[PDB]
Amino acid sequence: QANLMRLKSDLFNRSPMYPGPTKDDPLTVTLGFTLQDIVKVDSSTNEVDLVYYEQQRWKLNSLMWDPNEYGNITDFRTSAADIWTPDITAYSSTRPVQVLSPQIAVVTHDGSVMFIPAQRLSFMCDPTGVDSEEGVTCAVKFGSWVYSGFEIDLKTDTDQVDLSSYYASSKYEILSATQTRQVQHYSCCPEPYIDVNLVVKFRER
Amino acid sequence: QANLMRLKSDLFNRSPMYPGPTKDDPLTVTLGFTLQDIVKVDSSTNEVDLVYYEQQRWKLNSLMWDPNEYGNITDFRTSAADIWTPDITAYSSTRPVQVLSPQIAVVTHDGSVMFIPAQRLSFMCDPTGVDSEEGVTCAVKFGSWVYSGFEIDLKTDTDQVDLSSYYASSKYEILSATQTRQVQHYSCCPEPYIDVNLVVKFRER
Amino acid sequence: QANLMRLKSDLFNRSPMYPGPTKDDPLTVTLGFTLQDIVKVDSSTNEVDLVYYEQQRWKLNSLMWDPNEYGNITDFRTSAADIWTPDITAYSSTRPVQVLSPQIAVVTHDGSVMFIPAQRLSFMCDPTGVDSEEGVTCAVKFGSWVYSGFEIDLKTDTDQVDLSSYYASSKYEILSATQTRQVQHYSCCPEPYIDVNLVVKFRER
Amino acid sequence: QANLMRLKSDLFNRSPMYPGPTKDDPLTVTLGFTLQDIVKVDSSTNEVDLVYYEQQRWKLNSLMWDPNEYGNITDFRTSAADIWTPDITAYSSTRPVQVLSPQIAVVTHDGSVMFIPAQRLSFMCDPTGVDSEEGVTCAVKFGSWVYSGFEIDLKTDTDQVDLSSYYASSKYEILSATQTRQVQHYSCCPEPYIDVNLVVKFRER
Amino acid sequence: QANLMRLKSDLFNRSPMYPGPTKDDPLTVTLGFTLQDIVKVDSSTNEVDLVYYEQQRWKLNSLMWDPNEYGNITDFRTSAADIWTPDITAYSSTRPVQVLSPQIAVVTHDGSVMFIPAQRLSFMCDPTGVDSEEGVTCAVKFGSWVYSGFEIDLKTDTDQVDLSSYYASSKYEILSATQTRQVQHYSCCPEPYIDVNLVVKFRER
Amino acid sequence: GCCSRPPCILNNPDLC
Amino acid sequence: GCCSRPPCILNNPDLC
Amino acid sequence: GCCSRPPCILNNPDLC
Amino acid sequence: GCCSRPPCILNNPDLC
Amino acid sequence: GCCSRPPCILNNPDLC
């Protein structure tokens, strides 16, 4: 439409692309997971696959506008390729992550960007104990590939992994599923480091 | 082709890209399937693979023209990447969907776009009972990835999955194949949500 | 080549992209297969893979030129990506084709184009009885994806697939391999539809 | 760092690219192989996989220069996409070749090019005789995909495949691995056809 | 943002790409591995897969700036696609190496560039003995695909593979993992050659 | 029938 | 539920 | 044979 | 530890 | 040796 087509144009084709966070201007990023299923286990290789949705939230001053100057538009969706996006990455993966959906975000007049692609991840996990009462735990830290806590502030809004889409006929049952954020201070180093630790305790149904 | 090239030149190359639908300017997208075969059933992982043609239809003012100004040309074929196409996707895929054909659309002088590519889709399904005489039911729902019922109005013309092309020597027998639209009203949320639920009930032939 | 680079430049930097055929200006296309091997037979999924060379030819007046205006250059090779090519695909595949060769066409001065990529196709077929003396018959149809017989006239030169290059020590023996053109006239419709039906009967050697 | 940039600038941004050989300006291309290992032998599908270095050499003039006018630089390294490269293909592969290394070439002031990318190939071969004392013999022909012997004279420095880096704990022992240039003169046609036939006799250790 | 947007503006758009190192302007490259796990061991094909972080360092004059003229910025992170990067690669890989993460570098005011992507590597290794108590030793040489010792000086800060991040519950225990540099001086050739030899000795726990 | 081949359903959308 | 579908999660981040 | 190699089939389409 | 995580390795190249 | 490493191979085609 008229104004949206104008809005997007002013936000994207006018200014240079956000160059990323810095210690003088730390960016807060909120992360959460919606676990759909544990689609694979492999005891011959100690590999585990998940299928879940991954949301990430951040706010950028450069993506701000006056709605009144743009036909009262409060927000819009756009290709995630049109914006800057974080490097929140799994740290102990065994394969290249697969995207199971489009990558489209939502920018809000105040600057909020939200983004939730579907993913399949293969990570390191010895699953011996899966076929049993007590089950087995699998942990996989998530954090930024290259920013310390001084530049990107990784936060979760709840320590609890969303299991409301966890498959009814999945071969496994979630004994527990947490997304706890830890902030590490290393005696070696002045800057802090943040990871969000995905811990999933589960067994064969 | 001088007439045709000039037309395409005027539509695509001269007017900003359709920025997608809004609450202010909604869009009806019609979706339907043609199931060819159920190609993989995996009891150990719980995934099913289907090959089918996926049909998508919508109309845009941005894409209408007067045949008289373009030598009576009423409709043309151009590749889907030349146009805006919706984000209708399977909310439960376990692998990136695989395109099995060229993606080319037919644009009409009235703004009607149609697009029917073939696809291999792996999704979540517990197939216990496929050997049985009663079969097994697998379900996957399709919907916009980023749009609500207020921006994308998703429908079907028939609740029947078209089985006129089903592979005659399939290892499987289709007991029923439906593509039913569902409108969701959540207690939490003002805006409605629409999925087109693809349900196939089948057994070994 | 000062001439070839100049002829090639007058053909791809000046002329706008060919928009494909229209019912006013239809196109004749010549499909022909050279079967190298039946590289996979899968009874559990009901899939079969083939490696073959696929020829396609056709003629565009827009690729016409006077050799006398370009050093008497009669023809030349160019990447298939430099030109329009038909959308002749299998209607029955089960995975994306895999291209096993450079895709390079020979363009002639009379606007003639030929093109022969090597390919791995996975299409639908129940291979039951392949281990008997009678063997089994698989079949797959090829045709334009979005074009009818009014826009694309799809032909062959012979109803016999070339088997002179069939791997001498294949696991399978070809009892017959034909590529037959077919014209379908529908009650529903005035435009005819045309396809080439690749039919292959074989058994274990 | 400067002066190599001017050279590469004067070579790749000045003129259009070499349109490839013609019968009037033919090109000798020199092919060699460094067999590293036989990494896959499949009896049930009749596929064998090789890993090796593939050396390609040739000379254009469009790539000539005077070291003086350039500072005595006599050659340089550059990405293979910066330059034209022959279409020398395995004629009987079952899969797309996998580039296992950077594709970077060396261009010498006199017009000389060559580059040696690592490849993993799957081609057609019945391996029965391998678990034996005599061994088994595979063959795959390499040649240009579109160019006859009149446009590309395909040579090899030696009929002997380089085996000095053959995996020492390889599972197979090579009895012979050769690469012979073979010129065809079919009675139908005046133009000769050239191919290099990699043949490999081997057996389990 | 503002100062960083001009910095990258000038550092990248300002002038041309770095043509790579030479005999006159040699470049030193430091290499290091942080081994996370041994992922697959295939004794039927003699191939082992590893997942590790690959630390790479180098410094370019072309990348120097005054923190003064750019608002006191001493370092920045950016997509490694924005800069020249060395061609260090495994000499005996069997499959296209897989990148399991973002690829983003830190560029510092002195010209120092650093870059640590995560990787999956499959290389040739006869694993015979892994089950024993002595275990088994596999090795893989990493070196520049095209630059001799006169152009790239491949180094290690240590000989020892960082194992502080190796997976606690992996099937295998590293009896030892070393990344040891080697300068080779051949009898034929005055230019030297350098490789880092990643050597790992292991066994089923 | 018509609803079995891809180009016949481009041309005949709603009556398939 | 709302939180079981992508478009609803985009519209109700905290409300999930 | 000629019809067993890509560049020959390409130069001799009708004769194959 | 610091050497177990990618961004810390970047900020402490020699310090690992 | 030299002929078992790509960059040497590249400098010494003939002498390989």
G near B: at least 3 beta-carbon pairs less than 8 Å apart:
yes
Measure CB to CB from residue B89 to each of A39, A101, A169 and give the nearest one: A101
Contact between C147 and F7 using a beta-carbon 8 Å cutoff:
yes
Measure CB to CB from residue C146 to each of B9, B77, B120 and give the nearest one: B77
Are the beta carbons of B106 and F10 closer than 8 angstroms? yes
Contact between C164 and H4 using a beta-carbon 8 Å cutoff:
yes
Q: Which two tokens stand for residue A144?
A: 């930024």
Contact between J10 and E146 using a beta-carbon 8 Å cutoff:
yes
Q: Which residue has the tokens 């969706």?
A: A77
Instruction: Consult the annotation and say whether B75 binds a ligand.
Output: yes
Measure CB to CB from residue E145 to each of D8, D40, D101 and give the nearest one: D101
Instruction: Consult the annotation and say whether D75 binds a ligand.
Output: yes
The nearest CA of chain C is from the CA of H4 a distance in Å of 5
What does the alpha-carbon distance between residue D201 and residue A42 come to, in Å, rounded to a whole number? 37
Measure CB to CB from residue I3 to each of E114, E118, E164 and give the nearest one: E164
Three-state DSSP class for A175? strand
Instruction: Consult the annotation and say whether D185 binds a ligand.
Output: yes
What does the alpha-carbon distance between residue E20 and residue E17 come to, in Å, rounded to a whole number? 9
Q: Which residue has the tokens 């004067």?
A: D10
What does the alpha-carbon distance between residue D33 and residue D162 come to, in Å, rounded to a whole number? 6
Measure CB to CB from residue D100 to each of E62, E87, E93 and give the nearest one: E93
Distance of CA B114 to the CA centre of its chain: 10
Three-state DSSP class for C7? helix
Chains touching E (3+ CB pairs < 8 Å): A, D, I, J
Structural resolution in Å: 2.4
E near D: at least 3 beta-carbon pairs less than 8 Å apart:
yes
| Interface residue D57 vs chain J (CB under 8 A) | yes
A near B: at least 3 beta-carbon pairs less than 8 Å apart:
yes
> What are the residues of chain C with a beta carbon less than 8 Å away from any beta carbon of chain B?
16-20, 22, 25, 44-47, 62, 87, 89, 91-96, 124-126, 128, 145-147
Contact between I6 and E101 using a beta-carbon 8 Å cutoff:
yes
Chains touching C (3+ CB pairs < 8 Å): B, D, F, H
Q: Which one-letter DSSP state was computed for residue B88? A: E
Give a three-class secondary structure readout of chain E: CHHHHHHHHHHHHCCCCCCCCCCCCCEEEEEEEEEEEEEEEECCCCEEEEEEEEEEEEECHHHCCCCCCCCCCCEEEEEHHHCCCCCEEECCECCCCEECCCCEEEEECCCEEEECCEEEEEEECCCCCCCCCCCEEEEEEEEECCCCCCCEEEECCCCECECCCCCCCCCEEEEEEEEEEEEECCCCCCCCEEEEEEEEEEEEC
Q: Select the residue from H4, H8, H10 to test the D interface by mutation, using most D Cβ atoms within 10 A.
A: H8
What does the alpha-carbon distance between residue C161 and residue C165 come to, in Å, rounded to a whole number? 10
Three-state DSSP class for B84? coil
Domains, chain C, with CATH or none: 1-205 (2.70.170.10)
Please provide residue E109's backbone torsions phi and psi, each rounded to the nearest 5 degrees.
-50, -30
Q: Nearest CA to D123 among C101, H16, C116? A: C101
| The residue type at C122 | S
Three-state DSSP class for B113? strand
Contact between A186 and I1 using a beta-carbon 8 Å cutoff:
yes
Are the beta carbons of A167 and G4 closer than 8 angstroms? no
Q: Is A157 left (phi over 0), alpha (psi -120 to 50) or beta?
A: alpha
Q: Please, what is the end-to-end C-alpha distance for chain G in angstroms?
A: 10
> What are the residues of chain B with a beta carbon less than 8 Å away from any beta carbon of chain A?
16, 19-20, 22, 24-25, 44-47, 87, 89, 91-96, 124-126, 145-147
Give a three-class secondary structure readout of chain D: CCCHHHHHHHHHCCCCCCCCCCCCCCEEEEEEEEEEEEEEEECCCCEEEEEEEEEEEEECCCCCCCHHHHCCCCEEEEEHHHCCCCCEEECCECCCCEECCCCEEEEECCCEEEECCEEEEEEECCCCCCCCCCCEEEEEEEEECCCCCCCEEEECCCCECECCCCCCCCCEEEEEEEEEEEEECCCCCCCCEEEEEEEEEEEEC
Contact between D53 and J9 using a beta-carbon 8 Å cutoff:
yes
CA distances (Å), D190 to each of C94, D25, E5, H14, in order?
Answer: 42, 18, 63, 16
The nearest CA of chain J is from the CA of D71 a distance in Å of 20
Question: Which residues of chain A make contact with I15, given a CB cutoff of 8 A?
Answer: 188-189
| Interface residue A142 vs chain I (CB under 8 A) | no
Instruction: Consult the annotation and say whether A109 binds a ligand.
Output: no
Contact between C186 and F11 using a beta-carbon 8 Å cutoff:
no
Distance of CA C162 to the CA centre of its chain: 13
SS3 percent helix, strand, coil of chain F, rounded to 5, is 50, 0, 50
Chains touching I (3+ CB pairs < 8 Å): A, E
Measure CB to CB from residue D4 to each of E19, E125, E128 and give the nearest one: E19
Instruction: Consult the annotation and say whether B109 binds a ligand.
Output: no
Q: How many residues does chain C have?
A: 205
What does the alpha-carbon distance between residue A53 and residue A75 come to, in Å, rounded to a whole number? 22
Q: How was this structure determined?
A: X-ray
CA distances (Å), B131 to each of B172, C200, D5, D119, E21, in order?
Answer: 9, 30, 68, 44, 65
Please provide residue E65's backbone torsions phi and psi, each rounded to the nearest 5 degrees.
-150, 165
